[PDB]
């Protein structure tokens, strides 16, 4: 175990679509892999430092896998496409880094492409992002003549012979560039002066400081979220990627340099878990992969203590033992088996049958802390799915079971009378990618209906009703007779059944049958056909025919009673109420407030984050369809939002008629 905590670097590459996120990653692994695919975490070496490239989801609108991966990584490279400029959503990726207090460096990719303006990037970081950038390098040559890069801090430059990254020469700075470099070098020192008194008192005195001095201060400013170093080049034309690697080991934080992850005890106490390898074990799980030839892989981040291969861990979320079989590190083109993962590092475990993405793993004798929050988010959006021709069906109902493992947060059901296949999840985007991950990945071709909000039904007042089923059906006679007392149950409390049968008035056998009929009618309410919730059912009386009584009779009899009940109890539709934090440029505040209220929303409060304003608001899910458009239409593309389920609500009286 050649593990040093200080010389460890956990990175994530964040970028707007088309910036060079994948290309840069590809090149990064290549240059590091020259001594003697994807996958959640990938490891490599540069200048005696371990770099763990935490794989961006990506696609930034799934704000569950983002918050999770932001806690896993420590520093980020934010990649900009310097061709088009800085487009709308490029802001969104920046706001995320701000949200999770993660130190960052910028990388202006595509200095080779026509339209490559370095400065358009720098200025838009100052203005829109509010990033206070510090210029670390300057280009040599324009677009297609882009052939060198100057490092202004050390005052040296690099010419590139080809575009394959196989000829790199350290040259003295061209005369045509020496003045501009000197300007920006002086500028750089000035920035360092804000973070070192020693640098300050030298910068006043006229004396040029040492590299160790500047590097240390410019690094201090980065980890403290005050400045953002900017680097450039062409990832495609293999220019400046090695210098980007150097920047990673220089200015980006090690696990020692950041604020300690906060977890919760089983009592609700808030603890700061310290990154000590000798202390108790606490580790997060964040990706469950299916691997062709090892089995299930579950990717972990270790925060304190040591995860040792071939041992046991305690799963605070599920409350059970788990056997850690083997441990692995993922490299560019091979797998490495390891004996232990210590505090601050990352890899993937083998085995771990019962663990799901988002769970915590402690060291058996260790404090029973939880890293994430407890509750399970509800299924709120329904989508109908119809398989083409038999062959796709049998491998669709197979495709879903063979996928309800890495993501158990989606539910599958069958619609009461249409007999289709209904899939439900956490929102639109959650489901719209599951559909795609079936036609391409699992190769199932079928038709998909337009997303629809999952409503619920319930009574407002207590009633007392009876259901009978006396008919001559299929040669024989049928008799079932039940008398129930139903009342409303506090919100979120669900179902409750009570038996209060006195004198074998309804014989022992037929009691399960009555329950089964109740449930089935509780699937399809008498307002819109959505499931009935939050009620207490009480079976107190009834009757039976000595010979005509049957399970089927008391099933239908129980069904007829509960439909009659939910009808008489002054029913009411329930809609999900979402919780929305909306990040917006300070200026366009009024025009977003004066829109959430038009969505029947209620404002909770606005507090600044960075140079922008985040708004917290309660809005119904039904008034959230295609918000990503309306938002970017009223913020010139600069706005962005997140969404979480909070509770269920009794719908306003005007909305009810519109739904019935
Ligand atoms: N001219 C030029 N083109 C580049 C450079 N780096 C990447 N590209 C090109 O731009 C495109 C961006 O794709 P990619 O590298 O996957 O970016 P990405 O952000 O991963 C796209 P997504 O976010 O959808 O996965 C690619 O087609 C790539 O060939 C560069 O340095 N210069
Ligand atoms: Mg990609």
UniProtKB/Swiss-Prot annotation:
GTP binds at residues 15-22, 55-59, 109-112. One of its GO terms (molecular function) is GTP binding. Keywords: Cytoplasm, Elongation factor, GTP-binding, Nucleotide-binding, Protein biosynthesis. The keyword DNA-binding does not apply. It is found in: Cytoplasm. Its main location: cytoplasm. It comes from the Bacteria. GO terms for biological process: ribosome disassembly; translational elongation. Catalyzes the GTP-dependent ribosomal translocation step during translation elongation. During this step, the ribosome changes from the pre-translocational (PRE) to the post-translocational (POST) state as the newly formed A-site-bound peptidyl-tRNA and P-site-bound deacylated tRNA move to the P and E sites, respectively. Catalyzes the coordinated movement of the two tRNA molecules, the mRNA and conformational changes in the ribosome. Belongs to the TRAFAC class translation factor GTPase superfamily. Classic translation factor GTPase family. EF-G/EF-2 subfamily. This is Elongation factor G. It comes from Thermus thermophilus.
């Amino acid at each position: 175990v050649e593990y040093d905590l200080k010389r460890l670097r956990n990175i994530g590459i964040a970028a707007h679509i088309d910036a060079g996120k994948t290309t840069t990653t590809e090149r990064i692994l290549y240059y590091t892999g020259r001594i003697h695919i994807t996958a959640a975490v990938t490891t490599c070496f540069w200048k005696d430092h371990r770099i763990n490239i935490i794989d961006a989801p990506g696609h930034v609108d799934f704000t569950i896998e983002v918050e999770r991966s932001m806690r896993v990584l420590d520093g980020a490279i934010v990649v900009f496409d310097s061709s088009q400029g800085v487009e709308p959503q490029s802001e969104t990726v920046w706001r995320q880094a701000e949200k999770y207090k993660v130190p960052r460096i910028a990388f202006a990719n595509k200095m080779d492409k026509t339209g490559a303006d370095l400065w358009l990037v720098i200025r838009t970081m100052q203005e829109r992002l509010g990033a206070r950038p510090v210029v670390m390098q300057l280009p040599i040559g324009r677009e297609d003549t882009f052939s060198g890069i100057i490092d202004v801090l050390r005052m040296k430059a690099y010419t590139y012979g080809n575009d394959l990254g196989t000829d790199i020469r350290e040259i003295p700075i061209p005369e045509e560039y020496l003045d501009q470099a000197r300007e920006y070098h002086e500028k750089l020192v000035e920035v360092a002066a804000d973070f070192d008194e020693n640098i300050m008192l030298k910068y006043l005195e006229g004396e040029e400081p040492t590299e160790e001095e500047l590097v240390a201060a410019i690094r201090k400013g980065t980890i403290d979220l005050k400045i953002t170093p900017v680097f450039l080049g062409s990832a495609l034309k293999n220019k400046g990627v090695q210098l980007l690697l150097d920047a990673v080991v220089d200015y980006l934080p090690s696990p020692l340099d950041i604020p300690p992850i906060k977890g919760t005890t089983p009592e609700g106490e808030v603890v700061e878990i310290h990154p000590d390898p000798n202390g108790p074990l606490a580790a997060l799980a964040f990706k469950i992969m299916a691997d062709p030839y090892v089995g299930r892989l579950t990717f972990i981040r270790v925060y304190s203590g040591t995860l040792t291969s071939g041992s046991y861990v305690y799963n605070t979320t599920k409350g059970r033992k788990e056997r850690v079989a083997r441990l692995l590190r993922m490299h560019a083109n091979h797998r490495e088996e390891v004996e232990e993962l210590k505090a601050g590092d990352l890899g993937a475990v083998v085995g771990l049958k019962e663990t799901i993405t988002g769970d915590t793993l402690v060291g058996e004798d260790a404090p029973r802390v939880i890293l994430e929050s407890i509750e399970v988010p509800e299924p709120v959006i329904d989508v109908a799915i119809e398989p083409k021709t038999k062959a796709d069906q049998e491998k669709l109902s197979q495709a879903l079971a063979r996928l309800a493992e890495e993501d158990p947060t989606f539910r599958v059901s069958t619609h009461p009378e249409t007999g289709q296949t209904i899939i439900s999840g956490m929102g639109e985007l959650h489901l719209e990618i599951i559909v795609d991950r079936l036609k391409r990945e699992f190769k199932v071709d079928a038709n998909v209906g337009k997303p629809q909000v999952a409503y619920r039904e319930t009574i407002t007042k207590p009633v007392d009703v009876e259901g009978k089923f006396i008919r001559q059906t299929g040669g024989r006679g049928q008799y079932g007779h039940v008398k129930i007392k139903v009342e409303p149950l506090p919100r979120g409390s669900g179902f409750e059944f009570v038996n209060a049968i006195v004198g074998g008035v309804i014989p022992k056998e037929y009691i399960p049958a009555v329950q089964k009929g109740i449930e089935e009618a509780m699937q399809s309410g008498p307002l819109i056909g959505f499931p009935v919730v939050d009620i207490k059912v009480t079976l107190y009386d009834g009757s039976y025919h000595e010979v005509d009584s049957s399970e089927m009779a008391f099933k239908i009899a129980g069904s007829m009673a509960i439909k009659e009940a939910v009808q008489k109890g002054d029913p009411v539709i329930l809609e999900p109420i979402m919780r929305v934090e909306v990040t917006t440029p300070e200026e366009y505040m009024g025009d977003v407030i004066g829109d959430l209220n038009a969505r029947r929303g209620q404002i909770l409060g606005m507090e600044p984050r960075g140079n922008a304003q985040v708004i917290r608001a309660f809005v119904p899910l039904a008034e959230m369809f295609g918000y990503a458009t309306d938002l970017r239409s009223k913020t010139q593309g600069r706005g962005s939002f997140v969404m979480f389920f909070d509770h269920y609500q009794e719908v306003p009286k005007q909305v009810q008629e519109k739904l019935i």
